[PDB]
């Protein structure tokens, strides 16, 4: 399709998610999840909205003040932002852990190989996790002692509500990127970024540098003031107004 | 999936659509599409709202008054409501036609076999459609000559706008099941049922049996007063008020909506 196609990027990223499945990284359930992401993205406007920028500033602040920052990676992340998830882990000095709900050997390997394609030297935790998140079935709650297990601040993007929830109960401060503000994961996380992860990861990286040197007292003012409930509400309000406008345009009969 | 799970029904149908692709009936793109429907189902509340019940009564009435109704069947319909689609067709005296966006012989065959598991002798059209619906991709515009090609009323659920619109330009009265009330398909169709096909179909089969005796008079009064445009806006209003309410009440850490 021509570069001017209004569906240009979502189409571009869709092939990417399919290539993901082809590479054995992205699970079938992943394609379904991607579609949900697409629809929601169409609704918010395929751009980072103010409530998302707001939550991202707060999440970055929180990661810089963190003690053991950990960025989680699953099959979709690997298909969409392999390079950006690494850059983000460095800009935040957080470690990288592959963490799958539907964990298999090939999938962990392929995702591992995919990340390396961009940095053959990054430490990738999660190849053989020993620990478990309490409240989850064994095979779905694995976590590596050096990563999530010891983490205080965690970023689990595109995550399932059971895991997000078990993580909060476990005492971890949870940050996620999720285009569905109505999902359990989005509603349970401590900081929810409602934005397409292809836009949020590079943005959080930019915000990383822009905040690189901030008075710890400032980084603390930022997070201390952030209101995830207010954020969710504004996102729901954003979507509604969008629905009012969208319904007023396009082909009809 | 334990039935006690808060998201049992959501997960159940995700498994079904996945087992559909594996059984060769459902395409990969169909998995994404199922996901798109889910996004809209969330906005609606994952239930049958009034404006859906309304559109469905009209559709059934229209199908009962038709003389050459046809019900389409794609990979998603085949994996999610194989039995209800057959029930509905027979409760509406409509013919069944297999229609896919990504057509192949293995896919047509498997969708064919799945329907049989519910009726070993059910008639199935679209096996090798030969009529080219003009103004479309040859690859995705061929219909069955004894099916859609001569139908007066057609039901094409989870349809792409290009097909839904082309059929309208074909002079076919079109009914559809589409969770996105803003979709081109939802806008070009004569009667749009904004509801999940796993809820709408069995609900429509109910109506086709409870309406089988409605007088021509009553049925014509229904199809006659129906207003797709008003029904779509009614759907958007439901959603916008739900969003307003949730926003005001707040949803962070909220378990139940
Ligand atoms: N490309 C993407 N960018 C951002 N977010 C995404 C993307 N793809 C999927 N998501 C989000 O991740 C979720 C997909 O995972 P999952 O299937 O667990 O969702 P869900 O089950 O509906 O939510 P929950 O598990 O909280 O009930 C979706 O809710 C969607 O909002
Ligand atoms: N399980 C389901 N139940 C009800 N409706 C569904 C389901 N899955 C998908 N749909 C609807 O069918 C459509 C699938 O087709 P597709 O997504 O290709 O069309 P679209 O490009 O999103 O919209 P359009 O092509 O009409 O502009 C979706 O718009 C969705 O609203
Ligand atoms: Mg889930």
UniProtKB/Swiss-Prot annotation, chain B:
It is an enzyme of class 6 (ligase). Disruption phenotype: Only viable in the presence of CoA or 4'-phosphopantothenate. One of its GO terms (biological process) is coenzyme A biosynthetic process. GO terms for molecular function: acid-amino acid ligase activity; ATP binding. Changing residue 14 to A: Strong decrease in activity. Its EC number is 6.3.2.36. Activity is not affected by 4'-phosphopantothenate or CoA/acetyl-CoA. Keywords: ATP-binding, Coenzyme A biosynthesis, Ligase, Nucleotide-binding. Activity increases with temperature elevation from 65 degrees Celsius to 95 degrees Celsius. Pathway: Cofactor biosynthesis; coenzyme A biosynthesis. It catalyses: (R)-4-phosphopantoate + beta-alanine + ATP = (R)-4'-phosphopantothenate + AMP + diphosphate + H(+). ATP binds at residues 14, 36, 178-180, 184-185, 196-197. Pfam families: PPS_PS. Signal peptide: none annotated. Optimum pH is 6.5. Belongs to the archaeal phosphopantothenate synthetase family. Homodimer. Catalyzes the condensation of (R)-4-phosphopantoate and beta-alanine to 4'-phosphopantothenate in the CoA biosynthesis pathway. Cannot use (R)-pantoate as substrate and thus does not display pantothenate synthetase (PS) activity. Displays strict specificity for its natural substrates, 4-phosphopantoate, ATP and beta-alanine. This is 4-phosphopantoate--beta-alanine ligase. It comes from Thermococcus kodakarensis (strain ATCC BAA-918 / JCM 12380 / KOD1). The lineage of its organism: Archaea, Methanobacteriati, Methanobacteriota, Thermococci, Thermococcales.
